[model samples]
Target chain A: FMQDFEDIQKDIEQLDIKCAHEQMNIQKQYDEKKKPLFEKRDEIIQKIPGFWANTLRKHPALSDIVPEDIDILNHLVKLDLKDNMDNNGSYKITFIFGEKAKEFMEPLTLVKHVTFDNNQEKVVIKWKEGKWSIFEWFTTPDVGELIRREIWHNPLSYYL
Target chain B: FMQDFEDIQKDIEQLDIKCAHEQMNIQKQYDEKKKPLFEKRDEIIQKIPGFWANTLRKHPALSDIVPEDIDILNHLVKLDLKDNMDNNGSYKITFIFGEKAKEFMEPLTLVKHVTFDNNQEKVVECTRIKWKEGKNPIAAPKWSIFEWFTTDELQDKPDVGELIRREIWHNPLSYYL
Candidate 1:
């Protein structure tokens, strides 16, 4: 009697698993299509002053911002997720700092890598100034995910 | 100028449109595969006594169900969602009755159809409900209180219909407990 209902539950579990896979494959394909569009948007955004800095300071996740954090963001030339196709939810958030930020931050390359392990910050930089090279905001919970999913989608909403 | 930023927003809006289409296409494909599994689960559930009634009563949205509602649901042999491939978010929720309750309710097939416009309701009961004396569950008959009360009445309660489809239909056993 109980066995019949138990068997029924197994079939229902399979349906949910299949639904998740269907969602993932479709989003992965569209991610490639949207990548070029976002790149163009990022280029135009670079022309605007204090776009990333001003936007990040406004976001709820990074609300408790120090003055130094905002100054570093002013030089934020580019910010976008990288390492697609060969990853399982692991990607690097590439942050390109301007020449002025490079002087204080002293990153090896103009482009700094912030690695994430399964959507959590895995590789974080320790700056000589004691804060992470990316600053207090990077260490904030879900800051990367918020930027990737929300802020990157329509930054103008956060900016204006 | 602000014009540069405005143009970028338009392009972004187009991406949202394209993404929704892609997501819908993928969802329909997976739904086709899951349909047979859902059918199988429903058949097995019918073998158990009071499956549908017990499940619906425990669900938070339907928790306000009174004594008459529970008794009516006792005859509910099957409760499942139908349609959605050809129609955009349009569906029929079938609530089939059987045995002792069928003799009282006398419904061959009772379904509620929801569409995109005004969230309409359509009735396809083979026969009218034969309510017992003082057993009418509807607060206002033909006025959207009970399931049998509002049929072909063109009333709107999309929130309840959406809850039935999204939450109740998929894996009802969880709600039964």
Candidate 2:
């Protein structure tokens, strides 16, 4: 009876090893198929704004909002402002589209703005929309220099 | 026939690693002796307010009537005039502090005083603070921007502050806010 029990335990251990080997094989196949799909999706999404430029021209807000001409090389977009003021003051804006791109390659129709403080000594951020606003009063000293450093690192020579 | 069948069956089974209990005790001891202390150090660091807070208190006012707070450095404090302007459009001061430990471990601080629109398009003000040795630069373990509850909110019986202080008792630097 002891010999019989030992044989049964050995059989179970062998079966577990076989199961683990099979699982590893299946995981490899899944990863191979998944990798290309992820790459293609990102490539399609990145080029989409250029493809839909013509269709968006009809909408008054979007027409001039995202510059008629985008400098793809520079990664700069000339956008319209709610304040009607030049890039000087009082605007809220963001690059929220990057976060939403996982759902689809098409641009999600989101209208929002973000204003980052230029003053590094007081790293403050005050965002406003209509009557609602959110503000953070904090400071980071040499951040303006860092932003300037980042700007210089890559020449934003886009022809929009 | 039974031996051939048994050999094939053995290939399918794997070992059950119920190693004697000694190894488990060693792992438990390592975690208790090492991991907690490291986590404690990280927590204490986040709470430290850094040196920039003191610099702002010292240099609240600028040499000239500048329209905006200066941006000498990121952690330096300065005033913002847009929000805290009076009838005369003169600035009501506030300083900005913290966020430069990445470049150097020594805590840094910066300040800015708030100012009204100077009705000028292009304006820039700059200054440099020389670090002097043996100075009590600013409050050590500086309060993060996320901290700093109003005086009324704390009322000396700062329950929330006490909670943080006590919980961070293991290592006082572990301030998340």
Candidate 3:
């Protein structure tokens, strides 16, 4: 059982781990480059009225949103995501609403953080009055991943 | 609804696609760098007697295998896996047994390919176990799990393939020790 295979395989795994490290660095290198272009894209996107709401209306998961949700989402200006700690599957997703949303919802930035621990890191939004939160689903991991990987990653596909 | 967002995102996706291309290249870069080391390790491993069997015996999934199964596995010289292409979640697993196995099994080389269909698991069996009558394993958890590979009934069972590739192959020494 004790043999030279052990030493050789250790060297193999050591090389594989080195590969993993370099891959992470390469991905982070690209994320930084892509991040700015997306922000500029968003700046242009937030201009058109009802852009986010209209986009969300076409989303399979968000398609069933009631009129009231549409009213709130119509004021949505930006849907942003920031990967935390060098692409470790931990990310922050932010929903920024225009001032028009303040009539019913005071908090403009509703953010959710999905951490490495896989804990539900929820951000409580301060609504103006007794308006119930329509975005409780935002806390769900599936929704977060959908927003980051699907809807946010390629908004044009979901935008009708 | 999409005023300039459409044109704008198209540009964004153009950039993102470029990133994807670079990431793929970098991964391929590293895969080539690591492959030789693994092959060198395999060259050494093939010479060790009872190396694969001893390692598999320590595996939790194969720990309870019957004595006959262990006897057959003793001749198992090499358990090799090759990533199909671009690490696209597809790979070929090859199990090469020594000539000692020819008494009961026809100098076996049990090669199987695992592929993904729309993100669902699928296994393609490549070799039939030319087993002499009553030599093939059956009626045990180990037997049942092992047969799943050849039967192409691998999807619903425990992912012994992943265990073999990622655990056994990744750190064969951990089990062998």
Q: Evaluated with lDDT, which candidate comes out highest?
A: 3
Candidate 1 backbone collisions, by pair: none
- Report the lDDT tens digits of candidate 3 across residue range B1-177: 255666767777777788767767776887787788778877777777788888876888767666677767788888888875525689888888888888767747888887878887676656777777877765333444346456455544556677787777777888887
User: Which tens-of-lDDT digit does each residue in B147-169 have in candidate 1?
Assistant: 53345552343345577778777
Give me candidate 1's TM-score against the actual structure: 0.61
RMSD of each: 7.4, 26.4, 4.9
True contacts kept of 2: 0.00
Give lDDT per model, in order.
Answer: 0.65, 0.29, 0.71
- Determine which window of 10 residues in candidate 3 chain A has minimal summed lDDT: A117-126
TM-score, cand. 3:
0.72
Displacement of residue B67 (Cα, Å) in model 2 is 25
Best by DockQ: 3
Tell me the tens digit of each residue's lDDT in model 3 across A77-117: 88888864433457888889888888876578888776764
The candidates score, on chain A by TM-score, as follows 0.69, 0.24, 0.75
List, residue by residue over B1-177, the lDDT tens digit for candidate 2.
233323322331211012212333443444344444444333333343332232222321212212121222234332222221333233322334444422322334322222235642111221233333532222231222222223223233323222322332222211211
Distance (Å) between predicted and true CA of A19, model 1?
A: 4.7
Identify the superior model by lDDT, candidate 2 or candidate 3: 3
Model 3, position A75, has a per-residue lDDT of 82
Q: Could you give the fnat of all candidates in order?
A: 0.48, 0.00, 0.70
Error of 2 at A111 (Å): 28
User: Which structure among the candidates has the greatest TM-score?
Assistant: 3
